[PDB]
Amino acid sequence: GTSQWLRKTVDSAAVILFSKTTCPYCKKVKDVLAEAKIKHATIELDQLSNGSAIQKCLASFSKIETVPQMFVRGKFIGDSQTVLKYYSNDELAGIVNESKYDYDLIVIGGGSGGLAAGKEAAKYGAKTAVLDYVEPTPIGTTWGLGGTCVNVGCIPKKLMHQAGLLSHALEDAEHFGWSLDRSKISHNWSTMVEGVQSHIGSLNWGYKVALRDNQVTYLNAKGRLISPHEVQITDKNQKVSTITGNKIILATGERPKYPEIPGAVEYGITSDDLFSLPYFPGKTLVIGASYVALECAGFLASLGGDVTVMVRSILLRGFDQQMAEKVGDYMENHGVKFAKLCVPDEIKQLKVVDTENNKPGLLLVKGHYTDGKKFEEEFETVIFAVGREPQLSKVLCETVGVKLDKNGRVVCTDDEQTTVSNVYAIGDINAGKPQLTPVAIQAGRYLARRLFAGATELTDYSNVATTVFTPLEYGACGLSEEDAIEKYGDKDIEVYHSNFKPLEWTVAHREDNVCYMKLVCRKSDNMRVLGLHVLGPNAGEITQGYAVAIKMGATKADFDRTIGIHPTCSETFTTLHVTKKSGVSPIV
C-alpha cells in the first residue's frame, strides 16, 4: 500500500527530495538546489499520516532510513554529505540532467489542457516540451498559441455576447433617466473584431512568456507519436525530425465538422472563421442546434443581423428539454428565425466574397423539411455548427497500440492512462468526459502532480456545472428532469420551480414571466438535489456557487435553511415551494 505508492513515486519523479520541515540538513540541501537553479518536488515526511512507514520503505531504494534523500529519475543520488560532495566537485549539474530521453514529458497539443499540464510538470523539475500547430481552415484561417477556447471559442464568443448584451443596456438606460436615443445608434463589426483580436493576441503572447519563464521548450510544430517514447515533429518549413520522452500527454482537441453536401466546404464557414472575419456576415443562416449554434446566432441578432437557424430535430440535444425550449422561445421573440425539422441539401454560390471592399458574397441554400416539403432561400453567410471531432489518425500511428472508441476518442483509465503505460490523454479527446475548458485544466494539472510530485488526487468528472451564453443565459448543474425521472421513476422525483423577474427589468419594462428556475429532487434520499437549472441574466455567476453545495450532497432542506441575499436573482433558490405535482402555477 504505502510501499506501492513509494515505488511509483520514485520511478516517475524527475527530481524529488524526501525531507522533514524540522531538519537543518534538509534545509542545507534545499539551499544548494535553489542556488544551482535545480527545480524539484519535495515530500515533507513529518506532515503525512504514515510518514514513519514511508521513511522505512525508502531503505529498499537507498539502503538508508534517515533525513535527506534525493532521487533523480528513479535513482538514489545521495544524502546530505553526498549531494554537497557533487556540488563542490561541479558534478551535480550532469547528474540531475542525465536521462535516457530528451524530455521527461512531451505534450502534444498547446491548448487548455496541454498548457496547464506542461507548466505544472515543469514546476517540479520535469524537463518538458509543448508542441502546438494550427491546421488552417478551408479558407485559410489560422491563429496563435492557446487552443480552441482562447482563439476560436469561449473567450471571443463571450466577448461578442457582451457586445450584444450592451444593446439592451443602451435601451434600458433611457428608462433609468439617461438622454441617449437607442434608435439612432449603430454597431461596427470590424471595430469589435479588432478589439477582440487584440485581447486574444495578448493571450497568445502571455502563454509564450509563461512557457519561457517556466523553462518549457515550445515547438510550433505538428507532432506524431510513432512509438511509445518517440514523437516525430514537422515544422513550418516541412523539416522532419524525432524527439524522445519518458511520459507523453495527448492533448490535441477537436475541430468542426462539415456535412457531406455540395458547396459546404467551398462556400460556408464555421466558428473557426467567424471570430476573426474581416467583414460583417450580413444576412446569415446557422445550420445546427448545439450551444455553439445558438450562442452565435444570438449575438449576431443582437448586433443587428438578420439571422435564421436550421434545426434538424431538437435544440440543445442532451440538455434539459424544457429549459432548451424556453431558451429558443426567448430567441424567437427577440428576432431570431427558426426553420424547424429541416436539413440542407446543397449550397450554391451567387457572388464571390469581395475581399477588396470588405463585403460578404451571396449564396443560395436548398434543403427539405422532414415531411418532404422544400426549403430555398438566399443568404450572405452560411455557418455550419453541426458538431466537432478529433482527428487522431493525424496524431497517432496505429502500431503504437493506443485504443480508440467508435467515435475516435481515446479510451482511458480514471487516472487518464491509455492502453500504453507511459501515454496519457486529457481534454476533449478523452472518451466520455465533459468537453469543457476548466475540466481539461484540472485534469492536466492534477495529472502532472501525480506523475512528478507523488500526488494521489484524481479529477472528479461528476456533476460539472455548465452555462449556455445565449441572449438569455442558461446555467445548470447535475441531471436534467427527464434523466432523473428515467433513472429513479416519476413517483420518486419532486420538482420545485418558480418564475422570477430581475429587479433591473422593472423600470426597463422587460418581461414579467420569462426567467425561470427549478430544483429536481429525489424523495427517497432526503429530497437530495439531483439537478439545478436557471434561465436568466448572469446565469453562470448564479450557478457556480451552488455547484460546491451539490458536490457535497445538498438537500432541499439545505436550500431552505440558507437565507437569501436581497435584492438578487439568485435568492429565489432559497425560498422555492411550488411543486410540479401540485399543479399550482409558477408565475409571480
Ligand X SMILES: Cc1cc2nc3c(=O)[nH]c(=O)nc-3n(C[C@H](O)[C@H](O)[C@H](O)COP(=O)(O)OP(=O)(O)OC[C@H]3O[C@@H](n4cnc5c(N)ncnc54)[C@H](O)[C@@H]3O)c2cc1C
Ligand Y SMILES: NC(=O)N1CCN(c2ccc(F)cc2)CC1
40 vs 161, beta carbon nearer ligand X:
161
Task: Judge whether 161 is annotated as a binding position.
Answer: no
With H, G, I as helix, E, B as strand and everything else as coil, classify residue 334: coil
Nearest-approach distance from CB 298 to ligand X, in angstroms: 12
CB 105 within 8 A of CB 118: yes
Choose between 184 and 239: whose C-beta lies nearer to ligand Y. 239
3-state secondary structure of 151: helix
Q: Which is it for the CA torsion 526, 584, 516, 588, positive or negative? A: negative
Please answer whether residues 473 and 540 qualify as being in contact, where contact means their C-beta atoms are separated by less than 8 angstroms: yes
- The smaller minimum CB distance to ligand X, of residues 87 and 291, is found at 291
371 binds, among ligand Y, its own copies, ligand X, none (CB under 5 to 8 A by kind): none
Applying CB under 6 A, among 4, 81, 89, 238 the residue interacting with ligand Y is 238
Q: What is the DSSP letter of 417?
A: B
The residue whose Cβ lies closest to ligand Y is: 236
220 binding partner (options ligand X, its own copies, ligand Y, none; Cβ < 5 to 8 Å by kind): ligand Y
Binding of ligand X by 222 (CB under 6 A): yes
Quick note: the x/- pattern for ligand Y over 120-139, rule CB under 6 A, is: -------------x------
Residues 6+ apart with CB under 8 A from 538: 473, 569
C-alpha cell at 521: 429532487
**Cα separation of 472 and 538, whole Å?**
9
Q: Is 124 annotated as a binding residue?
A: no
295 is in an annotated binding site: yes
Window 116 to 175, contacts with its own copies (CB under 8 A) = 149, 154-155, 158-159, 162-163, 166-167, 169-170, 172-173, 175
Rule CB under 6 A: which of 231-260 touch ligand X? 251-253
Instruction: Check the annotation: does 202 bind a ligand.
Output: no
Q: Say how far apart CA 448 and CA 44 lie, in whole Å.
A: 19
Q: Which does 236 bind (CB under 5 to 8 A by kind): its own copies, ligand X, ligand Y, none?
A: ligand Y
Rounded CA-CA distance 221/238 in Å is 9
Angular region, 327: left φ>0, alpha ψ -120 to 50, beta rest:
alpha
Amino acid letter for position 189: W
Upstream peptide bond of 278 is cis (omega within 30 degrees of 0): no
For residues 246 and 496, what is the distance between their CA atoms, to the nearest angstrom?
53
The answer to the question of whether 4 is labelled as a binding residue is no
Q: Which helix (H) or strand (E) holds 86?
A: helix 80-88
Q: Which long-range contacts (CB under 8 A, 24 or more apart) does 237-244 make?
A: 243/102, 243/103, 243/106, 243/129, 244/101, 244/102, 244/103
Which one-letter amino acid corresponds to residue 540?
G
Tell the smallest beta-carbon distance from residue 92 to its own copies (Å): 27
> Which does residue 545 touch among its own copies, ligand X, ligand Y, none (CB within 5 to 8 A, set by kind)?
its own copies
- Rounded distance between C-alpha atoms, residue 251 and residue 133, angstroms: 12
Query: Could you give the string, one character per residue 214-233, with x where binding to ligand Y holds by CB under 6 A and - elsewhere?
Result: ------xxx-----------
Instruction: Give the C-alpha separation, 554 to 211, whole Å.
Output: 40
Catalytic-labelled residue, pool 368, 497, 566, 577: 566
Rounded Cα gap, residues 18 and 43, in angstroms: 5
Residues constituting the chain: 588
Residues in 287-306 that interact with its own copies by CB under 8 A: 303
- Judged by beta carbon distances under 5 to 8 A according to partner kind, the member of ligand X, its own copies, ligand Y, none in contact with residue 59 is none
Burial of 238 from C-beta contacts in 10 A (0-12 / 13-18 / 19+): exposed
Q: Is 210 in the site for its own copies (CB under 8 A)?
A: no
Cβ 391 to ligand X shortest distance, Å: 7
CB of 66 to its own copies, least distance (A): 28
Residue 464, binding choice from ligand X, its own copies, ligand Y, none, Cβ under 5 to 8 Å by partner class: its own copies
**296 marked ligand binding residue:** no
Residue 497 appears among annotated catalytic residues: no
Window contacting ligand Y (CB under 6 A); options: 89-97, 234-242, 262-270, 487-495: 234-242
Annotated binding site for NADPH: 157, 289-290, 292, 312-313, 317, 387, 435
Annotated binding site: 20, 55, 67, 80-81, 112-114, 132-133, 148-149, 154, 157-158, 222-223, 225, 252, 255, 288-295, 312-313, 317, 387, 391, 397, 428, 435, 437, 483, 509, 560, 562, 566, 574
Residue numbers at the binding site for ligand X (CB under 6 A): 108-114, 131-134, 147-149, 153-154, 157, 222-223, 251-253, 271, 292, 394-395, 427-428, 435-438, 440, 566
* Active site amino acids: 566
